[PDB]
């Protein structure tokens, strides 16, 4: 007997379920290009609160960034007669540097007032804190990986009498097998000293000064993306072409692995190329590798030497926005925007990045996207012969035409013995410092 209109049903499931197996987002997709599908990424956490449940995941972070933590092993309320507790707040995993500048619900509490005992969460397996001798040694937990902070005889008097939501500035050095080789500051320094001293003051040259207070924490972008693939298990990871400072990224547990990495591909713009099995992560530039003439393209599928698509004017992202973290002061969600002067009439396209970066840098990034997303309107769809197959999937083609000589970075190489390319328009001058003043 014949078939019904579940011919449309078997066309979907699993007719299209096989695809995504083997495979605000308003601005996330244009920056990766045709590329691949941009996974939902980094709904930035504002009002960081600590939930004491059992279903919250272990967070991870790299550098100076506040994290909420959560309660593990709180004793009963103790009335001195006007209360007292013994908390232990677990921040993040891995060996960390020390936790300074604790502030609870509200503005600020002085850490000298507290009796906190910070712990690195060392794989060395730090023993029991002995404040858990309330429980006793025989049931004292001895957390190996996670970096918990206990609190001792905490007076609940100044903040009500309820437990306040504590939030902790944490400094975590990037770890992993690629990180222990090639040591950056956080252990590479091996004794700096030279404290300038010589005592409201002269901090106008701090952004250009030789001294390294504050910014010694920030990990290079090379090892943090190496930490992601290390935790995911890819040790074949190649990352020598990366040049960036992270300064406090933070993704939670069960953040897909790649969706934590994909926020970095919007900020620093790097390729995630994978020429060979190395998965080369190179920083994206305009350095042209191909120099094709128009005479040197192959015969494509659609029988056009170069199909050139220019995207709609009604969707060009006239103004772009961020949701970065303040990273110098009290870590709070902020926003800058870049507005193109001719067409400001609409198309607001913003996204949220959960990392922490300064004020002139955020206006630099959004100034870079608004230029790039209007440059990346043009896409090219051509086929080039396997006589020059050394055009890796992330290279950029000069592509001489009779009218233009416009560069093109390429995506979605599908070859089978005929390299067919979905390029995208990329200029070299996009990837520069914006050189803006600071706050």
């Amino acid at each position: 007997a014949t078939i019904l209109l579940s011919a449309a049903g078997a066309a979907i499931g699993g007719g299209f379920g096989g695809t995504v197996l083997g495979l605000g987002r308003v601005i996330d997709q244009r920056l990766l290009g045709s590329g691949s599908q941009s996974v939902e990424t980094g709904r930035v956490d504002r009002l960081r609160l600590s939930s004491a449940s059992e279903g919250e995941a272990v967070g991870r972070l790299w550098g100076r960034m506040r994290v909420a933590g959560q309660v593990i092993w709180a004793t009963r309320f103790f009335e001195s007669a006007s209360y007292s507790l013994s908390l232990a707040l677990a921040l993040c995993e891995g060996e960390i540097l020390r936790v300074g500048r604790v502030w609870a619900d509200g503005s600020e509490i002085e850490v000298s007032g507290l009796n906190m005992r910070v712990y690195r969460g060392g794989e060395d397996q730090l023993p029991d804190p002995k404040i858990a001798a309330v429980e006793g040694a025989e049931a004292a937990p001895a957390y190996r990986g996670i970096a918990y902070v206990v609190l001792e005889d905490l007076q609940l008097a100044p903040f009500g009498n309820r437990v306040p939501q504590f939030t902790f500035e944490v400094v975590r050095a990037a770890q992993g097998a690629l990180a222990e080789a090639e040591p950056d500051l956080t252990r590479g320094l091996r004794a700096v000293a030279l404290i300038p001293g010589t005592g409201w003051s002269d901090g106008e040259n701090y952004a250009r000064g030789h001294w390294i207070s504050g910014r010694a924490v920030a990990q290079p972008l090379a090892s943090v993306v190496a930490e992601i693939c290390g935790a995911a298990g890819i040790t074949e990871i190649d990352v020598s072409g990366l040049y960036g400072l992270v300064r406090g990224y933070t993704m939670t547990g069960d953040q897909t692995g790649r969706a934590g990495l994909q926020a970095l591909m919007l900020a620093y713009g790097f390729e995630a190329l994978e020429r060979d099995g190395q998965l080369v992560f190179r920083m994206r530039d305009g350095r042209v590798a191909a120099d094709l003439a128009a005479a040197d393209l192959a015969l494509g599928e659609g029988e056009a030497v170069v199909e050139t698509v220019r995207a709609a004017e009604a969707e060009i992202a006239g103004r772009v926005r961020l949701a970065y973290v303040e990273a110098e002061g009290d870590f709070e969600v902020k926003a800058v925007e870049a507005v193109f002067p001719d067409a400001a009439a609409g198309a607001a396209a913003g996204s949220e990045l959960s990392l922490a970066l300064t004020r002139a840098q955020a206006q630099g990034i959004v100034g870079r996207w608004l230029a790039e997303a209007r440059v990346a309107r043009d896409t090219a769809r051509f086929a080039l012969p396997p006589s020059r197959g050394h055009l890796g999937t992330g290279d950029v083609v000069r592509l001489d035409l009779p009218e233009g000589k416009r560069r093109y970075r390429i995506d979605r190489v599908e070859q089978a013995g005929l390299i067919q390319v979905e390029a995208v328009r990329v200029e070299p001058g996009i990837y520069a410092p914006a050189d803006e003043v600071e706050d």
Partner: protein, 134 residues
């Protein structure tokens, strides 16, 4: 794979067949081309055999497909057209012969055969294509 026999002797005029190649090709649209060959050899790919004799020859021919055939056996094939080289160019053929003397082991390119009766004793079948699997 067998070494059983050549074939029934009879082959009609029209037993066609010649070597193959995959040699996939891109045809660069604005100039010349470039093309690759993964073989270094050639499938001889003989076709269009015809048995034409009495019906006494037919029952030894229909079970030729069946008995030693099945699908997946040799039955070394006789060419009317140990390493043979071809020296008429300054290039070379240098194509091997696993079997002796042009015997090119093959298999039939058919799920079924189709023998016809043309008269009281005439037995005909129009085609039995082969490709010479190694």
């Amino acid at each position: 794979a067998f070494h059983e026999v050549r074939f029934p002797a009879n082959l009609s005029f029209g037993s066609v067949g010649g070597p193959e190649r995959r040699t996939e090709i891109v045809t660069l649209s604005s100039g010349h081309e470039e093309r690759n060959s993964p073989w270094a050899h050639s499938r001889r790919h003989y076709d269009a055999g015809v048995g034409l004799r009495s019906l006494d020859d037919v029952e030894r021919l229909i079970a030729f497909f069946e008995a030693r055939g099945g699908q997946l056996h040799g039955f070394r094939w006789k060419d009317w057209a140990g390493i043979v080289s071809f020296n008429e160019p300054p290039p070379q053929g240098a194509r091997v012969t696993a079997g002796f003397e042009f015997d090119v082991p093959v298999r039939f390119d058919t799920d079924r055969i189709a023998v016809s009766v043309q008269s009281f004793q005439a037995g005909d079948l129009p085609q039995v294509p082969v490709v010479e699997v190694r």
